[PDB]
Design a protein around this ligand. Structure first.
Ligand SMILES: *[C@@H]1O[C@H](CO)[C@@H](O[C@@H]2O[C@H](CO)[C@@H](O[C@@H]3O[C@H](CO[C@H]4O[C@H](CO)[C@@H](O)[C@H](O)[C@@H]4O)[C@@H](O)[C@H](O[C@H]4O[C@H](CO)[C@@H](O)[C@H](O[C@H]5O[C@H](CO)[C@@H](O)[C@H](O)[C@@H]5O)[C@@H]4O)[C@@H]3O)[C@H](O)[C@H]2NC(C)=O)[C@H](O)[C@H]1NC(C)=O
Lengths: 225, 33
């Protein structure tokens, strides 16, 4: 909503309080190919007769919501952050990828209060998915999730050199014999890639074009509750 | 990996340039290959 340009009289709001997220996250906007792969994979799990886009959406529109929620949870349990369900380009509500769209610099007095928490890991965002998967007991399929997460660390398209640099800088040498330190390092890498640094970059890119105050906070980790 | 330090008190330390030599040994050698 901050990115989308609008007529000045019909501005839907004045300020913005974003607690723990940004448009400049790499998983914020999903490309067309990944979205269509997600749709046909969900079609395969629900066993719709995949022939055409209209046919698969007509088949999917009649299934009960519980079945669709269960299938999307099962697919999302072993899928990376780039394979989540997110907004697409659409050409009408949004035009261009968010980093390019932020450089128009046309907004009319939109403030910003943005921040993060030290215990907002992307693994911690999927606690309910893990609890549902352990409720079905699907072999405790967490090494597939961790492998897909580590591959997602290597940019949009999985590249070897960014993967090697990420495995060097944080200490996630692939030692799955002890999952504690490796899992903490994987949370560390995904938190610094998807959450903290895009928030900092968005706060910088909003404060640089001075047409609105920017305030940033950070909550340290709170043990308990 | 103990080493002496030629200071006034002559103490003992354990890590000499651990981050820098981990960069120059683990990462950049793999990047070289
Ligand atoms: C994921 O992200 C987490 C953050 O959310 C990380 O947790 C934090 O990791 C950092 C890593 O640097 C820790 O920072 C260290 O803090 C030490 C505090 O002192 C005491 O606390 C430690 C326990 O928390 C304990 O293990 C320490 O031994 C110590 O008792 C600092 O001492 C430490 O300093 C390092 O860097 C200095 C730079 O100059 C250097 O002087 C230090 O010297 C030591 O080593 C040199 C060799 O280099 C020797 O010559 C010296 O004699 C001395 O022994 C040392 O190198 C460092 O700043 C931080 O504590 C930790 N926790 C928190 C709450 O922030 C995770 O580590 C990340 N990774 C994973 C896998 O989870």
């Amino acid at each position: 909503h901050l990115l989308t340009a609008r007529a000045t009289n019909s501005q839907l709001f004045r300020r913005a309080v974003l607690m723990g997220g940004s448009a400049l996250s790499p998983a914020a906007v999903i490309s067309h190919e990944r979205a269509q792969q997600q749709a046909i994979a969900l079609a395969k799990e629900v066993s719709c007769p995949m022939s055409s886009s209209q046919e698969v959406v007509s088949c999917l529109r009649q299934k009960p919501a519980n079945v669709l929620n269960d299938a999307q949870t099962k697919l999302l349990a072993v899928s990376g952050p780039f394979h989540y369900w997110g907004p697409v380009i659409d050409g009408h509500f949004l035009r261009e990828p968010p980093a390019r769209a932020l450089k128009r610099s046309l907004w009319v007095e939109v403030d910003l209060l943005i921040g993060s928490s030290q215990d907002d890991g992307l693994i911690n965002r999927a606690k309910a998915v893990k609890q549902f998967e352990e409720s079905r007991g699907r072999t405790s399929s967490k090494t597939a999730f961790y492998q897909a997460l580590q591959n997602s660390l290597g940019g949009e398209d999985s590249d070897a050199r960014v993967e090697a640099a990420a495995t060097w800088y944080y200490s996630l040498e692939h030692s799955t014999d002890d999952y504690a330190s490796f899992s903490r390092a994987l949370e560390n890498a995904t938190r610094d890639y998807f959450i903290i640094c895009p928030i900092i970059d968005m706060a910088s890119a909003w404060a640089k074009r001075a047409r609105g105050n920017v305030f940033m906070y950070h909550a340290p980790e709170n043990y308990g509750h | 990996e103990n080493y002496k330090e030629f200071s006034e008190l002559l103490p003992n330390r354990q890590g000499l340039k651990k981050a820098d030599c981990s960069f120059w040994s683990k990462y950049i050698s793999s990047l070289k290959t």
